[PDB]
Design a protein around this nucleic acid. Structure first.
Ligand code: ZN
Ligand code: ZN
Lengths: 78, 81
DNA sequence: CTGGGTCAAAGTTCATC
DNA sequence: GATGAACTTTGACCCAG
């Protein structure tokens, strides 16, 4: 591989919903959109996302997905 | 490989295994024990045979067996909110 | 290449000592 | 405070097209 995840910095093989992303962030974004998940996420504090801490705050992760350009409309409701 | 509805045994204590945890076929007991040990960096005075009935009698030996059977500290992840 | 699905193995909770 | 049965989410890998 040569691409990296725009969300968390993990290895990325391709683009998912408009953005270079890892299998993790692809799966996470899919589930969030499909289930209409809203995250309260205790203390968001610094919404820093990296491979080791991506699962710490779901709110911070989702917000980063949108900030980097992931498209809700690109998630097929199958 | 491992499958959730298939009968397996714990490599540490011989109890019924709920699949592989941290690289080794283990029970929910040895999984939770290893997880807590690594997450808290727990120190065990204890320093013994590890089996279903006597696995809680010596925590030092339970932990040393987890490592000896191939449980990986790096497989334990960071806590989630 | 992109999408989606699967399900093992990561996660957490808490009743009961 | 520890344990571990039961519950929830993640993501590596497969594959349709
Ligand atoms: Zn990612
Ligand atoms: Zn065990």
């Amino acid at each position: 591989t040569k691409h990296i995840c725009a969300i968390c910095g993990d290895r990325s093989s391709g683009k998912h919903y408009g953005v270079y992303s890892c299998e993790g962030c692809k799966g996470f974004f899919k589930r969030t959109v499909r289930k209409d998940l809203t995250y309260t996420c205790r203390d968001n504090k610094d919404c820093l996302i990296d491979k080791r801490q991506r699962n710490r705050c779901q709110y911070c992760r989702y917000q980063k997905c949108l900030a980097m350009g992931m498209k809700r409309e690109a998630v097929q409701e199958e």
